[PDB]
Amino acid sequence: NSNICEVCNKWGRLFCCDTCPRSFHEHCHIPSVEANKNPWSCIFCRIKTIQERCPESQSGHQESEVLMRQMLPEEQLKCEFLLLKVYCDSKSCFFASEPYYNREGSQGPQKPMWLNKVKTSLNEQMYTRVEGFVQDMRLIFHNHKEFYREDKFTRLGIQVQDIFEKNFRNIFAIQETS
Ligand SMILES: [Zn+2]
Ligand SMILES: [Zn+2]
Ligand SMILES: [Zn+2]
Predict the structure, then answer these.
(1) 30, 80 in Cβ contact below 8 A?
(2) Same domain membership, residue 69 and residue 28
(3) 21 CA to middle of ligand 1, Å?
(4) Residue 34's CB: how many other CB atoms inside 10 A?
(5) What's the CATH code of the domain at 147?
(6) Strand runs labelled E in the chain
(7) What is the rounded (10 degree) CA torsion for 149, 115, 16, 19?
(8) Does residue 33 sit in the same domain as residue 105?
(9) What protein residues have CB closer than 5 angstroms to ion ligand 2?
(10) Among residues 27, 135, 130, 28, which one has the least CA distance to residue 79?
């Protein structure tokens, strides 16, 4: 296996996937790595396995259909993997922990949101539909855009939002369009 966590790229205490060569710190992997499980497989393998067992699940879907799906075990896993793909981009540090808002000319967001909040809200089965998870991830980036106004630090929202959307279309097989 690899010598650096797949998500964060650093060495440390790691756990190795038994089916693929990736490796993970405990709370870098989503869900957080399970006690025993021998063999273990990772969320990269377990998403793969879904596609292989139902190849038509890679056919195009409409975002409206995808959002209204209940958060059954397989939609839970996709939301868990989609989130993990955002933590993989180093610019996710800016959105990880709780934010505070004190800038001249700006007011903070009516509803704050951050990546560890959404992580915990996934872990705690607080979302019933995919619409729930998506609406939070999109609030993270819409709050940042409105708060940092014309300052060039806005862009980091746009960049980590682009990483989100692209993996959303991939993982949920949204119908490609121009
Ligand atoms: Zn890590
Ligand atoms: Zn794996
Ligand atoms: Zn089939």
Answers:
(1) yes
(2) no
(3) 15
(4) 10
(5) 1.20.920.10
(6) 15-16, 23-24
(7) -90
(8) no
(9) 17, 19-20, 42, 44-45
(10) 130
Report the C-alpha gap between 171 and 178 in whole angstroms: 19
Q: Which ligand is nearest to the CA of 6?
A: 1
In this structure, the answer to whether residues 44 and 76 fall within a common structural domain is no
**Nearest ligand to residue 88 Cα:** 1
Judge if 25 and 64 occupy the same domain.
no
Overall resolution, Å: 2.3
CA of 43 to the centre of ligand 1 (A): 14
23-24 and 15-16 strand pairing: antiparallel
Domain containing residue 2: CATH number: 3.30.40.10
**DSSP states of 10-58:** --SS-EE-SSSS-EE-TTTSSSPPPS--SS---HHHHHHHHHHH-GGGG
Give the whole-angstrom CA distance, residue 160 versus residue 89.
8
For ligand 3, a single-atom ion, the residues with CB < 5 A are 54
- C-alpha 84 – ligand 1 centre gap (Å): 11
**CA of residue 170 to ligand 3 center, whole Å:** 20
Name the region of 110 (left: φ>0; alpha: ψ -120 to 50; beta: rest): alpha
Experimental method: X-ray
Domain count, the chain: 2
